Amino acid sequence: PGLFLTLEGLDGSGKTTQARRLAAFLEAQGRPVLLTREPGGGLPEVRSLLLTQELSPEAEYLLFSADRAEHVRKVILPGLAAGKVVISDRYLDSSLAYQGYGRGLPLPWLREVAREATRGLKPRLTFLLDLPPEAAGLEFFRRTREGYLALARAEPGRFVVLDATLPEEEIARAIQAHLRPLL
Template sequence: MPGLFITVDGPGGAGKSTLLPLLGAAFEAASHIVHLTREPSDGLLGRTARQRTADFHGNALACLVAADRFHHLAEEIEPALARGQIVLCDRYVPSSYVLQVLDGVPLDYVRHLNVPARRPDVAVILTAAPHMLEARLRERGAHSRFEHDGSSGPEVHLYEELRGVFADDGFPTFEVDTGEFPPQAAVQAISWHVGALLSRTQEV
């Protein structure tokens, strides 16, 4: 059976880092081989992008993230999919659309950069009310300059505004409100959705 590519995006504090290991464990319990990864990746380009958001801005950061993505796909994601694994990726193209636009890059430019990127089988989008996200960020601390201002409203609203763009660009989204659903319930909802997709794939 071919592999399955699942990406998980959403504003800072939405629970991606909490959810991914739980989701991976759920698929492994169902006898799937799971490959957990993230973007920016743990490769040289990804580490540079992740650790130096204070130094790179605008088009430069958008191009660096895109370059890391294509290397990540070629060296890690595509081989895992070819082996029939379920690849779970913490952040992917939808995060680029949102964060690069917030960084002053025109949306059309970001879309053009990411045209060659493989589309996932499921693009999970996590969300929650801005005040909940801000409370979580205060508790765990900011991971990059995009989270330093303590305001989640612009990021949440941009994810909402870009729903149609994600669909137009080939990202089959599945939204989960982590303010409404605790982690295990969110995992169950995503697992059910992916299980239905796997069933349809096996029937074909």
């Protein structure tokens, strides 16, 4: 039946290091893992389109969504069906935080697009590396950072909020502890 986990945070939060440590830790426990990421896990070329100058926030979200739709269908759901722990470094919450809270797109529209895009697939746990925004324009990063924390307040059983300024090995231990019962 598989287990779906995601990592979230601003760039430079350690989200990527923790994703990779978590995969190693599960693979060293002998259990099959698939490590993936967004953007690009669905449509690797999306990275090009995303860099378009002056891209509207609507277009930006739709590009992330096109990647995400492919990613869920071709990578994530097949991996879960094989009984893998699938870990995504970024998933839907990244859009909600960056394009919703950061760029100001309406959350309900984002969720409706996502409903089909993701086939309703939600992570069992999402580890949010909460990084002060200055350590990542600043106003945008503040909105995005706070957005992530709003998302975590709204779904307090799914989100595990971690202080990204802690040493890496302490963050990893905290992630491992959250995960032990779901083994």
